[PDB]
Design a protein around this nucleic acid. Structure first.
Lengths: 595, 287
DNA sequence: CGCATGAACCCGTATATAAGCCT
DNA sequence: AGGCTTATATACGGGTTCATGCG
DNA sequence: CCGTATATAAGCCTAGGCTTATATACGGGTT
DNA sequence: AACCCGTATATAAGCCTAGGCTTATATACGG
């Protein structure tokens, strides 16, 4: 080139910790279930619930404090929801290895708590309601700094605590569109919707009024049997129990059904959130990588390694692309006047850290990254807008479409979500939703016992729900299902994999079994146990790409563990209780005896 | 003898502004009458009586106007032939005593909306007006004499417009079929990167777009509940549980995106759906 | 003191779900 | 990624091996 | 005997949102 | 020292959905 044309600098390629799924990574079907194991309870309501949380999450501002501490569990106990049965719920839960008999939540935990779990759920109920219809408060009204629906609302002796709102709903029931469940399946098993039934005019027309313009636009009019609800005699929406008795009124499952449809309803009429999703989407700048169905973070899909590896590859490219421009005729002459604020001084801040490159020994290259990161930031201005090593949960755009529960995805197997909790706004002290750089360390300290649940607690630790669940989601299947004819109706694509510390291990340990590459090509686990969980992964190229990803998943979950574990323990030791100034001391102090 | 002390006569037929479309020669009668009735009573003509032929602020054409109309009423050598009175009777039957103005206003509209020649679809929407037959009876008559109606210019260029709005859709219907009949695995492969979008915030994903069409194809363009439905179809397909935005679009906003999408595909087959439409065979006219 | 007659289990094809194999 | 082939489970009648009751 | 004009609700005239497309500089630094 | 430009704002100009205002069926009074 003339003056060696600067190396190509593609922004999209260097996704700001936000690739995307396009749900086409699966144009190869693999609904296969080779991952059978005791810690694999197929739960239908799994999906829906995630919705709930995620919805609350991406609207952290529009809910009370306690409303943001919910965990996938909290819901379960709250609404007599038992995982396992692929038909909806499942009264009971097998306790222990050998035990055909089952247990309910009362038989299980403590009754006080069970109440709480309910109370919360029902709070969320009126919450959503007031949020939807009672949109008289456009954010800055009678309740500026403080979500509209508060606890004191749910503990008013007023007869019609729910009736008034509820009433306003049924008024717009049909209009809003009823949920798939609450529709009276076409009283005939002959009708569809692409075809209509009511043949209005018996015959059509032939010799029409205007000869010269035979345009017979409407040969005949028909009628459409549209999605109608149920008779008020069997339409849960009109359940009189709810009126003066919260949401517990509906059957365990139906409770969920309403909740879900309630969320969708909210963000489609709410003079609040719906009006806000606009300001989110219609932002004044679209993502370099483009607009998609769902976006996720880089390290979620590239593994902890490459997410940094790519960074090195880049943090070095930009160095050249700067110094080839820095060593340019036109540019050098215009530094005697300051061509730019940054694009003048940033040149300088390079040669100072570059002298620190060849500086110390060679074995300390692992130092540059965690020693120059902060002083490297300024450089990512005159070039890329946003880059790999960033925090996804701080930029408008990278939100609405970003599912903050993605933990990755594995070829010919599927996606893996972990329904967490609070993730945006205030109290983001111990959120695992952060810059891979931060996250990396923030997790690390827990693995080393440098950060106890105590510390977790001292910094708004209650902000994050403790309990959690892992989930395999058969996106591959649910895809080839829709893509071929949107058949779905009563199927399942959601599965529980664990629900606490040790369980996670039983899964982690379980994981390896697949990651293991059958070196048994040079021929020529426990016995009789693949009766309750098959292990070996299919030895063949196509399933290599799988292992590699499966590996990182383990790696992550393995690190995640510690912080997760502590969360559980936290809610066990503490449980809603401010630290304070006169109390904080005594609190931590008690651990000096503990040790 | 008859004592009728008045001032003016009745120099005017009927209010033909509400012309129920009747033999134009029937006005020549109500004037042959107006005049005869005049002298039969005696009520002398005056420049004052010159209201229909007014439009004059005291010029010098009025010098004869009065004395002219005068010797046209006084000179009424035609108090209606016994045959004329026959031509009278017969013509005032051929007319449309029934139709009025509310029957018209509502007619003309639907007569363009529910089709153009789709009588039944427009007649039915005039039940209190007059029966299916009674409607058609005005039908052929309407076009037989469309070129003879007050403002027939304006009243037509509104019917045609509601037609050009209907054909435009029905044509889109087809265009959607063709494009779909093309892709074996539409949900993935189907795309129309020719008239997509320029510099606009493409809130909807290249994918979502696809979906919304595949459902438009599911229920077919029908200017009815179609977009209301697809919204449900969205709310149903669990693949978009988390695509909050997608279910954050009302059947309205959602619909809008459609009217865009459609038109996009429209500017893609109007070069083939109009040429393939041009070649339609008949009895003695080969294309 | 052995013969006529059931219940549990062993044994051979038909079929479906999946890994092996290959270019 | 797309097609083979070989393989492992899993279900169903067919029928072998013991043990009760009976003359 | 009729004439000049409201009662009473149905339909059209004109307004405001939300998108889609066209025309003017912006420093980019090359040849 | 004038060239061509991909980007991005301003501003014009279309459909749709939504109120305010006349637009035609008869019934009242007086002289």
């Amino acid at each position: 080139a003339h003056e060696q044309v600067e190396p190509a600098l593609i922004p999209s390629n260097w996704t700001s910790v936000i690739p995307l799924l396009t749900s086409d990574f699966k144009n190869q079907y693999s609904v296969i279930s080779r991952l059978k194991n005791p810690n694999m309870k197929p739960v239908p309501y799994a999906g829906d619930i995630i919705k709930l949380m995620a919805f609350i999450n991406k609207f952290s501002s529009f809910f009370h404090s306690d409303l943001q501490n919910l965990s996938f569990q909290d819901f379960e106990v709250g609404l007599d929801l038992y995982p396992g049965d692929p038909n909806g719920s499942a009264a009971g839960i097998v306790k222990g290895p050998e035990d055909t008999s089952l247990l309910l939540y009362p038989d299980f935990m403590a009754i006080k708590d069970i109440v709480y779990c309910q109370d919360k759920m029902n709070l969320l109920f009126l919450s959503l309601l007031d949020l939807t219809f009672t949109e008289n408060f456009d954010g800055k009204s009678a309740k500026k700094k403080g979500p509209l629906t508060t606890w004191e609302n749910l503990k008013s002796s007023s007869k019609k605590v729910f009736s008034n709102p509820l009433y306003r709903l049924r008024l717009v029931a049909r209009e809003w569109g009823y949920p798939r469940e609450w529709r009276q399946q076409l009283p005939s098993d002959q009708d569809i919707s692409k075809p209509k039934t009511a043949l209005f005019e018996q015959d059509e027309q032939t010799p029409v009024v205007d000869p010269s313009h035979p345009e017979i636009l409407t040969p005949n009019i028909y009628t459409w049997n549209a999605n109608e609800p149920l008779p008020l005699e069997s339409n849960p929406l009109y359940n009189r129990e709810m009126d003066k008795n919260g949401i517990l009124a509906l059957k365990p499952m139906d409770r969920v059904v309403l909740l879900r449809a309630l969320t969708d309803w909210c963000a489609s009429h709410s003079s609040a959130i719906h009006d806000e999703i606009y300001k989110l989407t219609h932002g004044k700048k679209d993502p370099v990588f483009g607009i998609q169905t769902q976006q996720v973070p880089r390290y979620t899909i590239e593994g902890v390694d490459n997410t940094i590896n790519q960074f090195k590859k880049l943090c070095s490219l930009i160095q050249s692309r700067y110094e080839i421009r820095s060593k340019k005729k036109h540019f050098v002459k215009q530094l005697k006047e300051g061509k730019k604020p940054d694009l003048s001084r940033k040149l300088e801040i390079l040669k100072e850290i570059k002298a620190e490159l060849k500086n110390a020994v060679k074995s300390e290259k692992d130092e540059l990254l965690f020693s120059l990161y902060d002083k490297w930031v300024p450089l990512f201005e005159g070039e890329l807008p946003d880059q790999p090593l960033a925090n996804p949960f701080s930029e408008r755009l990278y939100k609405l479409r970003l599912q903050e529960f993605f933990l990755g995805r594995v070829p010919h197997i599927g996606d893996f979500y972990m329904p967490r909790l609070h993730s945006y706004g205030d109290s983001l002290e111990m959120s695992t939703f952060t810059d891979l750089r931060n996250l990396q360390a923030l997790l690390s300290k827990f693995k080393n016992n440098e950060y106890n649940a105590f510390t977790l607690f001292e910094n708004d630790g209650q902000s994050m729900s403790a309990q959690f669940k892992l989930f395999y989601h058969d996106t591959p299947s649910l895809a080839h299902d829709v893509a071929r004819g949107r058949n779905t109706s009563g199927k399942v694509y959601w599965y529980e994999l664990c629900h606490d510390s040790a369980t996670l291990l039983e899964f982690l340990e379980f994981l390896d079994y697949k990651i293991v590459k059958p070196q048994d090509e040079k021929k020529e686990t426990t016995d009789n146990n693949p009766s309750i969980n098959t292990n070996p992964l299919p030895k063949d190229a196509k399933y290599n790409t799988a292992r590699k990803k499966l590996q990182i998943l383990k790696e992550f979950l393995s690190d995640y563990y510690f912080i997760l574990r502590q969360f559980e323990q936290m809610k066990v030791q503490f449980a809603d209780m401010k630290p304070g100034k006169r109390q904080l001391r005594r609190i931590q102090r008690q651990t000096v005896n503990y040790n | 003898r008859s004592s009728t002390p008045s001032h003016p006569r009745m120099p005017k037929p009927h209010v033909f502004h509400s012309h129920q479309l009747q033999p134009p020669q029937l006005k020549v009668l109500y004037e042959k009458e107006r005049m005869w009735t005049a002298k039969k009573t005696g009520y002398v003509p005056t420049m004052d009586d010159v209201k229909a032929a007014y439009g004059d602020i005291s010029d010098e054409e009025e010098k004869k106007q009065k004395l002219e109309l005068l010797k046209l009423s006084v000179n009424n050598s035609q108090p209606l032939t016994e045959e004329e009175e026959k031509m009278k009777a017969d013509w005032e039957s051929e007319g449309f005593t029934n139709w009025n103005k509310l029957e018209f206003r509502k007619f003309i509209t639907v007569s363009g909306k529910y089709g153009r020649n789709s009588i039944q679809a427009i007649a039915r929407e005039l039940a209190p007006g007059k029966t299916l037959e009674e409607v058609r009876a005005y039908a052929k008559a309407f076009w037989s004499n469309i070129e003879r109606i007050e403002d027939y210019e304006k009243y037509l260029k509104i019917i045609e417009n509601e037609e050009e709005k209907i054909k435009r859709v029905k044509m889109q219907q087809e265009a959607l079929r063709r494009k779909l009949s093309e892709y074996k695995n539409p949900f993935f492969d189907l795309k129309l990167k020719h008239p997509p979008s320029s510099n606009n915030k493409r809130t909807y994903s290249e994918e979502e777009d696809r979906f919304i069409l595949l459902m438009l194809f599911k229920y077919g363009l029908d200017r009815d509940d179609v977009y209301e439905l697809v919204r449900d179809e969205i709310r149903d397909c669990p693949l978009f549980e988390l695509d909050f935005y997608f279910r954050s679009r009302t059947p309205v906003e959602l619909a809008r995106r459609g009217n865009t999408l459609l038109q996009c595909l429209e500017k893609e087959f109007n070069a083939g759906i109009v040429l393939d439409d041009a070649t339609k065979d008949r009895m003695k006219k080969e294309d």
